[PDB]
Amino acid sequence: TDLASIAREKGIEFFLISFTDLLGVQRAKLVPARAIADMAVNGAGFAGFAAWLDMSPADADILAIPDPESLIQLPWKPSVGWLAADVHFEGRPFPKAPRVALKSVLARAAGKDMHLKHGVECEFFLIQPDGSAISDPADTQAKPCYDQDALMRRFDVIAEICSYMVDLGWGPYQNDHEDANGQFEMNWDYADALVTADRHAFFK
Amino acid sequence: FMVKSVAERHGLRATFMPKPFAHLTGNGCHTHLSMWTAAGDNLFEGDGELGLSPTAYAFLGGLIGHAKGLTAVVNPTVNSYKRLNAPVTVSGATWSPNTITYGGNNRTHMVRIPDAGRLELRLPDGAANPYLMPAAILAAGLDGIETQADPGQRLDIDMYVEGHSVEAEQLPLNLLDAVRALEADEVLAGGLGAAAAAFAKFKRAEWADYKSQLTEWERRTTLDC
Numbered sequence: 402t403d404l405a406s407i408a409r410e411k412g413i414e415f416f417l418i419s420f421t422d423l424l425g426v427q428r429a430k431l432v433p434a435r436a437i438a439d440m441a442v443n444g445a446g447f448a449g450f451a452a453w454l455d456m457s458p459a460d461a462d463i464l465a466i467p468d469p470e471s472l473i474q475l476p477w478k479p480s481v482g483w484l485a486a487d488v489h490f491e492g493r494p495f496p497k498a499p500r501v502a503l504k505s506v507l508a509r510a511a512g513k514d515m516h517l518k519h520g521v522e523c524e525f526f527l528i529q530p531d532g533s534a535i536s537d538p539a540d541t542q543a544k545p546c547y548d549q550d551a552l553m554r555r556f557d558v559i560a561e562i563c564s565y566m567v568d569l570g571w572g573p574y575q576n577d578h579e580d581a582n583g584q585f586e587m588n589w590d591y592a593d594a595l596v597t598a599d600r601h602a603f604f605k
Numbered sequence: 606f607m608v609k610s611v612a613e614r615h616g617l618r619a620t621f622m623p624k625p626f627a628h629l630t631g632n633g634c635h636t637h638l639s640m641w642t643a644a645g646d647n648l649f650e651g652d653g654e655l656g657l658s659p660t661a662y663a664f665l666g667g668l669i670g671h672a673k674g675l676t677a678v679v680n681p682t683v684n685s686y687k688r689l690n691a692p693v694t695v696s697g698a699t700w701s702p703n704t705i706t707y708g709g710n711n712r713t714h715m716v717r718i719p720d721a722g723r724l725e726l727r728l729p730d731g732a733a734n735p736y737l738m739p740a741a742i743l744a745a746g747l748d749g750i751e752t753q754a755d756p757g758q759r760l761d762i763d764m765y766v767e768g769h770s771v772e773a774e775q776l777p778l779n780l781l782d783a784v785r786a787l788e789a790d791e792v793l794a795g796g797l798g799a800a801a802a803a804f805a806k807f808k809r810a811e812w813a814d815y816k817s818q819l820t821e822w823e824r825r826t827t828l829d830c
């Protein structure tokens with residue numbers, strides 16, 4: 402996959418070359434389109450100790466090699482392209498990196514012709530910017546699950562994200578107000594574990 | 606009067622309110638009772654279970670038999686019914702009655718038998734009239750004696766826990782039902798004279814006044830109906 406050509410074709414001006422650390426933190430570097438070909442082949446350098454990877458400030462940089470098939474133009478900002486990456490250290494995948502660790506287990510299972518597929522139901526709350534209370538002061542009842550009123554009160558945000566997921570080809574199919582006040586969930590189709598994992602990281 | 610007056614002199618205030626705080630134990634007025642001859646003999650003292658006489662058990666039989674109407678008088682306020690049949694408190698027990706039952710040395714019942722020769726009625730609260738309470742208790746107790754009332758079976762269990770696995774009559778759940786019961790109780794009403802009907806009139810009006818008060822709880826739970 403020719404990221405440089407895609408950038409010109411799709412009008413992508415910056416790429417986020419991203420990896421997930423041991424604490425689930427999304428680590429990313431913002432690279433201008435002019436530099437993507439270099440990063441695609443060689444990876445993007447990061448000081449590994451600065452993320453949750455259990456390294457040393459004395460270690461050589463890790464190189465995050467992007468998976469070109471993971472490319473997502475941010476639906477809310479299409480001029481930026483997100484890529485999930487495998488952390489490499491000293492010329493090979495780094496076993497302490499989550500995505501690398503997953504791919505290792507998947508390869509052992511695949512060797513036995515067993516392929517994991519999964520789907521995730523990622524519940525979340527919508528809260529005030531300061532985090533102190535839910536976003537909807539009118540969502541108060543003891544049993545709020547599937548509350549039509551509170552659900553529609555957040556239609557704009559929920560509908561925007563659902564429609565992004567349609568466009569992204571994830572096959573979204575239901576959006577719910579969940580059992581806690583202020584809590585929601587948006588489902589999408591299961592897939593090969595690696596695909597779902599990347600989608601999961603991006604979704605949040 | 607003394608307690609209120611003195612508290613006030615100390616910059617404090619005393620209340621005998623039955624249930625002044627939602628999640629805390631309420632104010633009881635536990636009443637210990639026995640009947641004596643003029644010669645000075647305690648008629649409750651006896652050779653029956655727990656050192657009680659048949660007279661004692663009959664008197665109790667009257668308390669049990671007339672419990673619903675008696676509740677109107679010894680639990681005379683709307684608030685009284687938040688002390689009775691209350692949800693468990695922070696301290697782990699309400700220490701008030703829920704059911705028309707009696708035990709031995711057991712504080713989970715309507716009546717407790719603390720020792721030989723007396724009964725503890727745990728039903729009354731701090732709003733109980735100092736004169737009407739003993740009067741209604743006596744009226745009921747006398748009818749029990751006169752009719753040789755059977756109080757039924759003593760329950761040696763914790764009613765708060767091991768009470769759902771037994772047949773026990775529930776106390777009136779509000780002032781309205783208590784007053785309804787007092788009005789239907791010929792012995793109590795008749796025993797108290799014209800006081801009973803006048804008392805019932807006032808308590809009915811109090812209950813109606815209570816009904817008309819709009820509460821914050823109803824607003825929170827009903828505005829979105």
Ligand SMILES: Nc1ncnc2c1ncn2[C@@H]1O[C@H](COP(=O)(O)OP(=O)(O)CP(=O)(O)O)[C@@H](O)[C@H]1O
Nearest residue numbers: 517518519520521522575577586588589590591592
């Ligand atoms: N054979 C399969 N293997 C793995 N995941 C699957 C699967 N079949 C369906 N899924 C996925 O599991 C997730 C949940 O599916 P579904 O909504 O049908 O279950 P459920 O109804 O118990 C969820 P909820 O309680 O929120 O409605 C979805 O992502 C779905 O794609």
